[PDB]
């Protein structure tokens, strides 16, 4: 199907059954459906901690580099995952959400203590 515009984007396809999310890191034409056709699958991601308490992430770094070079963009979740991986700098919103969480914790601690 001819697409008017659009561009490659490295993103996540939400597979897995209900209440059991699981993501396939794929490089697909941005206009294509979320779980639909995709140019190439670059890895996978399991949000639910496994028996070892690990959120497994597989990133085919070679192909990820190749596609970023070819000009694929990066969805915010993928940028955050790469930042956690250390392949990219920590996302500004990751840092700022950490700080917001810290302030929330400080506020809640103060409120609980000031009974």
């Amino acid at each position: 199907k001819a697409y008017r515009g659009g561009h490659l984007t490295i993103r996540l396809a939400l597979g897995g059954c209900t209440n059991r999310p699981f993501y396939r890191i794929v490089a697909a034409h941005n206009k294509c459906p979320r779980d639909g056709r995709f140019v190439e699958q670059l890895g996978s991601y399991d949000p639910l901690p496994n028996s070892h308490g690990e959120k497994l992430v597989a990133l085919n770094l070679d192909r990820i580099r190749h596609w970023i070079g070819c000009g694929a963009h990066l969805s915010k979740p993928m940028e955050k995952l790469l930042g956690l991986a250390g392949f990219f700098p920590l996302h500004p919103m990751m840092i700022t959400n950490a700080e917001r969480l810290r302030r929330k914790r400080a506020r809640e601690v103060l409120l609980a203590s000031q009974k």
């Binding site: 059991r20 699958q41 028996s51 085919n60």
Partner: protein, 168 residues
């Protein structure tokens, strides 16, 4: 039973046995041979037995035959570069002809193995998808990870049906 002499010729197991895979340069092959002649018996047997294998292994290489066009039998390959390779087959057995053509125009086992590696690259184990393409459909298949909800119900803590209950 299967019809015709040497019905084995009409089985994939035999057709795939062809070891001759022409280089991409070859585009056409013409087999001139005589239906009679003791010397041409080798060429006749070659046409009867091996040509099907060559064609099966080289679907795009056109193959055409010519009965009793010239006193002597021969093959002639026309390459993409316009070159013409004339191969004499008189007095040769079909096996000898096959080996000669393999030597002079067939891809070597090294090239074939290289093609095999290029092909197998596609089947990345780490990828997940329908059995048709990837080994595992969902990471749940991997042991240690949270198993699929269908086979094993998730804890009430993880099911969103009760996260909303907590929300209330």
């Amino acid at each position: 039973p299967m019809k015709g002499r040497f019905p084995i010729r009409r089985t994939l197991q035999y057709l795939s046995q062809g070891n001759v895979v022409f280089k991409d340069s070859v585009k056409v092959m013409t087999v001139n041979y005589n239906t009679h002649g003791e010397l041409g018996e080798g060429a006749r047997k070659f046409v009867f037995f091996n040509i099907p294998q060559i064609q099966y292994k080289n679907p795009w290489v056109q193959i055409m035959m010519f009965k009793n066009m010239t006193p002597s039998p021969f093959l002639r390959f026309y390459l993409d570069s316009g070159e013409q390779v004339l191969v004499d087959v008189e007095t040769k057995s079909n096996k000898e002809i096959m080996e000669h053509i393999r030597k002079i125009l067939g891809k070597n086992e090294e090239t074939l193995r290289e093609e095999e590696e290029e092909k197998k690259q596609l089947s990345h184990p780490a990828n997940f998808g329908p059995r048709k393409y990837c080994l595992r459909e969902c990471i749940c298949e991997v042991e240690g990870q949270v198993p699929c909800p269908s086979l094993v119900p998730l804890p009430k803590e993880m099911r969103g049906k009760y996260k909303a209950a907590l929300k209330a």
